[PDB]
């Protein structure tokens, strides 16, 4: 019951799994933020304004202040 953007930026959500391609030098990783793509370099994993709240909220629900 997790969103597709949530599963693409953080497939395993208590560790990093880096996804950046910042200087640009699963392969098909991208959010829904852009619908223009013909190659792997186009795929921007930029978090959305709503995505960066639904899956920035799932860290107080991981722990539970001691036990």
């Amino acid at each position: 019951r997790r969103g597709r953007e949530e599963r693409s930026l953080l497939p395993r959500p208590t560790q990093f799994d880096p996804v950046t391609r910042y200087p640009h030098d699963d392969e098909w990783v991208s959010s829904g933020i852009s619908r223009l793509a013909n190659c792997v370099a186009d795929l921007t994993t930029a978090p959305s304004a709503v995505g960066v709240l639904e899956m920035l909220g799932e860290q107080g629900k991981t722990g539970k202040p001691v036990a």
Binding site: D26, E27, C39, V40
Partner: peptide
């Protein structure tokens, strides 16, 4: 790198 990079 043979079955997942095929975005052509």
């Amino acid at each position: 790198q043979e079955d997942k990079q095929r975005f052509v």
